């Protein structure tokens, strides 16, 4: 069930690792090939995977519409990359030593245990309040003042890509006299100025 576990952590559940659209990853029942008081860590480890799938299920559907939202999605693909990288590292380990235990992966995968729950709720606010427009630039910044150095350096990267859209529309407008917008995205709608959608900082 070693290789069975890694695949479940990548988005492919099985019989021993059932899937639910409401709860998420969870151990099904008791198995005779597992320790009676070991199922604990697997359920805790599965909570790391349950976040991962809801990422992809949100990414693939892209669901709300707007370039800033869509570009925020691709920005979310960059931060998840070390999670894809570090998980693949274990493959070289077990093929080398086939007798490793289930405890080692928890000791290796502690850093990602903390990053997701802080960034996962950032997605929840968007799906629960319909944050449409440039206001996404503030919701990512409002949590950018977080205390955790890794969580700060993660959303920092998304901001570094999310601004990649604003700078472009800002450049094509402040230099050529036309605006590239069709969904009430830019904060400039005889033109006027918008304050209730203007960024915070």
């Amino acid at each position: 069930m070693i290789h069975e576990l890694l695949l479940a952590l990548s988005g492919y559940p099985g019989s021993i690792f059932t899937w639910n659209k409401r709860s998420g990853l969870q151990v099904s029942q008791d198995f005779p090939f597992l320790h009676p008081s070991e199922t604990s860590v697997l359920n805790r480890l599965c909570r790391l995977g349950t976040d991962y799938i809801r990422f992809t299920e949100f990414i693939e559907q892209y669901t709300l519409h707007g370039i800033y939202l869509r570009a925020f999605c691709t920005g979310l693909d960059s931060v998840l990359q070390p999670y894809r990288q570090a998980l693949l590292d274990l493959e070289q380990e077990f093929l080398g030593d086939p007798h490793l235990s289930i405890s080692h992966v928890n000791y290796f995968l502690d850093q990602f245990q903390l990053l997701f729950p802080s960034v996962m709720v950032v997605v929840e606010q968007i799906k629960s309040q319909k944050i449409h427009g440039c206001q996404i630039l503030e919701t990512v910044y409002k949590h950018s003042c977080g205390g955790l150095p890794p969580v700060r350096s993660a959303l920092e990267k998304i901001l570094a890509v999310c601004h990649g859209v604003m700078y472009k529309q800002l450049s094509a407008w402040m230099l050529h006299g036309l605006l590239l917008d069709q969904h009430e995205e830019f904060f400039i709608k005889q033109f006027s100025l918008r304050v209730e959608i203007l960024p915070s900082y």
């Binding site: 008081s37 199922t39 604990s40 805790r44 000791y107 502690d110 729950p117 977080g146 205390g147 955790l148």
Partner: protein
Amino acid sequence: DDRVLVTETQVIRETLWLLSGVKKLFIFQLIDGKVTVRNNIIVTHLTHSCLRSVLEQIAAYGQVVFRLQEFIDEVMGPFRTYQAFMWALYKYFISFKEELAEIEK
């Protein structure tokens, strides 16, 4: 009175899990946020009572690590200080966990 008659090496593995902060262990079954040794554990030696003695001490250490894990849990699931305080505590646990995990090897 019946007893389970566990082997010897199995205890050390269980003790390592208690050090790790994991719950729901065949030994050290907590009841009210207070880890407590079971009553039917016995080895071929150690007359069934010294085992209850030696485990009772390690249990006292489990309380120190179980309560802290309960604290870190109640922060993950904008104070900016407790949240910044656990990150120091959390950082210490990872390194401490590595020494315990290595022994299991």
